[PDB]
RNA sequence: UUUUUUUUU
């Protein structure tokens, strides 16, 4: 508006709720020392999985949501209990979910795996993250659950805060569930 | 046409022909109906996203065609130049002397529709890598046209050298394994872009970015290798065009000549759309191809072969053509031109032009006639029956005595098989 | 906007577990998450949660427990007609078809399974009915809102005089 | 699928 002629309206109305169903599969591993106290550190550490993103664009919101889901329900390995020298955290998930979003329009997907592996160093904590994901659209007529429903929430509190920890701005519509707004980045 | 009546009944019939082949088209018929060469592209994504998509797809080797087309459109758009003359062709006009033009000012742009594929995006791609990326892609297009490992590797090593001399520390993309970009030749917009680039950088050869033309030189004379042969024969013989077209002596290359020489279809205009008829889509089957003019091609290249020509031992040998009749005419013409040298006065000082003093002669025997004219050669050939002279065959054999390289189903092979005997 | 939506409701609740429950707080914690993975009608989602509250108020034992203490088990069943004031806006049309859910609950000390069979559908009748908020047996104290929040249901106890349903973010 | 010098900045 500060200039003239810089688009008008955008009649196509990208700003509107759109639903997207898809199968998801996830597997995550985290390695470090000085074993891992509290959940805020989980978000802080995993937030550096895409420092230099080289993945298939258009899937960034889905990948971020998926990393959040995987970080939510990660189960520590017995070695953490037995030895504290080199703990390890593992996670694995798979299912079919449908997400509402208003980012835009997603092109056709594909059933290809994607691997990411990066080191991290956040203050006292240092180590490695290694994820492997596979998302692909589903054209069936099943009644899948909402992706948010897959979060139990009996650990950690508030979804706006947590969605911001990962770089994700969402909304809290009174009569429904959380809908995406944009990626803060 | 001619009438053929059934004798026993006197009935009237009209024998038609089968059509296993396909019909013929001329460029003039495209500009006689519609006057705009369409070109469809996508412009939704910015330049950096397309750069990332192209670079990463090529590194992995799963790049999409539409993204490459859009990248070439978004890269070759700030290049321009001056303009000397009045460019025009087939009732079209482009600019006027004393202005500036781009590379896509030759074809009309529009909006491609339909869903589009995805890519693998990158967030670190310096701008400096645009100098050579279109060059790399055009070189890939060029090298992906010949199915031969030796030639392919020689051409790709030339391409790597071309990229190196500009942006050394450049590294090869599209690794040596799974082969890509060989299906792109089946697409229509990529070849239109390549042809437009080739024409533009062919007219303005002094441009600083002319090195792109390394990748588009195969696109100019495509599917038109019957005119090239005619010109090469005209140059080797050294005579004018009238004497060359006179020396045919069979109505099979003449049919092709009549098919190739029509009022429209302006030839000899370097700044025209003629050579790029194929890529631009102006014609499906070009009338100057070698699959619809086999007799002309074979006769021309055999005449060239029998006159100590270089580009004669690597031509192909099309089949379904009667070699006995074209071969005899080609041999006769070759002997006629290579057995009598025309000497005479060319420039005369004032009223002192030398006149040939030849009215008394003794050439009533079988010996050859002096000068070069079909009228006096057909007479000598008829008077000496159709049998080639032993001297003619000796000349033919000594003309093809030594030949090092030969390839199966080549005119050189045929000559060494029948004439070297 | 205070919208009064009428419906007939039927509810059947069952809980199975070891370590038989002692305090109502543990039972409420176990039942609050009966919908870990909801695949029912979206537009009826909040209403079902309200009905779960009712089931909590109607926790009962059975002769099975008196027959053996090593298979703790609680039953409950309710049904009738009611209408609810709500400020969720407008609810879609509702059908009369049964719905069922069964989930495992794991809170550490208490572990087992929870089963809920609900059927909520429109009340096309024009006769008056009591308040759905004035239908439970929790005359108890003013901590109805605390119980709802512990479930995760936001209600208002202001001068309106009722416990009207308020909002979502029931997840915490 | 076209093509038909293992010619070509």
Residue numbers in the entry:
A (entry chain B): 43 to 227
B (entry chain A): 2 to 422
C (entry chain C): 58 to 229
Paper text:
Vesicular stomatitis virus (VSV) is a negative-strand RNA virus with a non-segmented genome, closely related to rabies virus. The VSV RNP complex assembles, together with M, into a helical, bullet-shaped structure, as it buds through the plasma membrane of an infected cell. The asymmetric unit of the VSV helical nucleocapsid, which repeats every 9 RNA nucleotides, contains one nucleoprotein (N) subunit and two (chemically identical) matrix protein subunits (M1 and M2). N is an elongated, two-lobed protein of ~420 amino-acid residues; the single stranded RNA binds in a cleft between the two lobes, with nine nucleotides per N subunit.
We obtained a helical reconstruction of the trunk at 4.1 Å resolution, and a local reconstruction of the basic building module (one N and two M proteins) at 3.5 Å resolution. Helical reconstructions calculated from segments that belonged to unflattened classes showed substantially improved resolution, the best being the reconstruction obtained from the 38.5 subunits-per-turn class, which had an overall resolution of 4.1 Å as judged by Fourier shell correlation (FSC) analysis. The model from the local reconstruction map was then also placed into the N = 38.5 helical reconstruction and refined at 4.1 Å resolution and rigid-body fitted into the maps for the other N classes. The innermost layer is the RNA-N protein (RNP) complex, which coils into a left-handed helix with a polarity such that the 3′ end of the (-)-strand genomic RNA is at the tip of the bullet-shaped virions and the 5′ end at the blunt end of the trunk. Two layers of matrix protein (M) surround the RNP, with the same helical symmetry, but with a different packing within each layer. A local resolution estimate for the N = 38.5 helical reconstruction and analysis of the refined temperature factors in our model show that the outer matrix protein (M2) layer is less well defined than the inner matrix protein (M1) layer. We explain this observation by partial occupancy of M2-layer subunits in the outer layer, consistent with the reported stoichiometry of only 1.5 M proteins per N protein in virions. As evident from the superposition of two adjacent asymmetric units on a single common nucleoprotein subunit, the molecular contacts that govern coiling of the RNP ribbon into a helix are not fundamentally altered when the number of subunits per helical turn changes from 34.5 to 41.5 between different virions. To describe the subunit interactions within the helical nucleocapsid, we classified the interfaces according to whether they are within a layer (lateral and axial intra-layer contacts for the N, M1, and M2 layers) or between layers (radial inter-layer contacts). Table 1 summarizes the observed interfaces in the N = 38.5 helical structure together with the calculated interface areas (IA), or buried accessible surface areas, for each of the contacts.
